[PDB]
Design a protein around this ligand. Structure first.
Ligand code: AD5
Length: 264
């Protein structure tokens, strides 16, 4: 039966959607019984660099929403030396949970979601952000439209009440080779669309974690692309999962691709 105040306005808490490390997100109602999601971040043990990172996420998100409506709407925020309250729009469900429940995705809906994702990541790229660690969980379904909730800075968020994929599965090869590019996100997006298309991520079948990394980077490992009705889609997946960034398709190319632009 808890409640919370953000910028002079009081919000009753219905339940906790999920928590990741030093942050929590709640389903809340306002004064006029309108629904929102409020993110609470605890800064008490957050280091100087970590504070600066959270500052950046708010700053960008605050600006970016004015450009595109495929980035989560932040209606209001409150920020102090010990806490952050972010009042965002409420979404029905994160994509990762939705994808776990949907054993088969509708080809039309997949295609729509893909266009929603592309528009979102295109917008962050245009403002000089490479998300780098892109996941399905970074996308939120609000009224049949995917929206980008998280910019990948210092996130550990899971829902808080089977778990097939690992953390590494969507990661680019260059990031593993690193020990950079907008096209690094294109690889990650590619894996999301690949999961939606074939039911698993490209390297899910690999048992061992050590070798799974080595498998991603290795050019002599070939990825499966079983034939499907949409020969467009099959091209997009291949084009996204080409290991070399220079050859790998760019976001603007993906937008003018037939899959996105051609009606069937
Ligand atoms: C801004 N930020 C938001 C969310 N963040 C969540 C943070 C934890 C991981 C999932 C996303 N969830 C939102 N909605 C959800 C509603 C129900 C959800 N669940 C239903 C399925 O089982 C898991 C919880 C998950 C997210 N809305 C939202 N607006």
């Amino acid at each position: 039966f808890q409640s919370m105040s953000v910028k002079g306005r009081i919000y009753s808490i219905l339940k906790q959607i999920g928590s990741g490390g030093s942050s929590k997100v709640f389903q809340v109602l306002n004064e006029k019984k309108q629904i929102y999601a409020i993110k609470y971040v605890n800064l008490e043990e957050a280091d100087n660099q970590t504070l600066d990172s959270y500052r950046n996420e708010i700053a960008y998100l605050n600006k970016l929403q004015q450009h595109s409506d495929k980035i989560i709407r932040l209606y209001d925020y409150e920020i102090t030396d010990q806490y952050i309250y972010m009042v965002m729009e409420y979404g029905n469900i994160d994509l990762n949970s939705w994808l776990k429940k949907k054993k088969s995705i509708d080809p039309w809906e997949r295609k729509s979601y893909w266009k929603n994702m592309l528009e979102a990541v295109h917008t962050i790229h245009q403002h000089g952000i490479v998300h780098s660690d892109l996941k399905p969980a970074n996308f939120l379904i609000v009224d049949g439209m995917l929206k980008l909730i998280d910019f990948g800075i210092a996130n550990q968020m899971q829902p808080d009440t089977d778990s097939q994929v690992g953390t590494v599965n969507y990661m680019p090869p260059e990031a593993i080779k690193d020990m950079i590019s907008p096209k690094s996100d294109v690889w990650s997006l590619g894996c999301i669309l690949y999961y939606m298309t074939y039911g698993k991520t490209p390297f899910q079948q690999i048992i061992n974690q050590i070798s799974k990394l080595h498998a991603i980077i290795d050019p002599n490992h070939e990825i499966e692309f079983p034939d499907i009705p949409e020969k467009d889609l099959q091209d997009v997946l291949k084009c996204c999962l080409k290991r070399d960034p220079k050859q790998r398709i760019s976001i603007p190319e993906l937008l003018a691709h037939p899959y996105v632009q051609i009606q069937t």
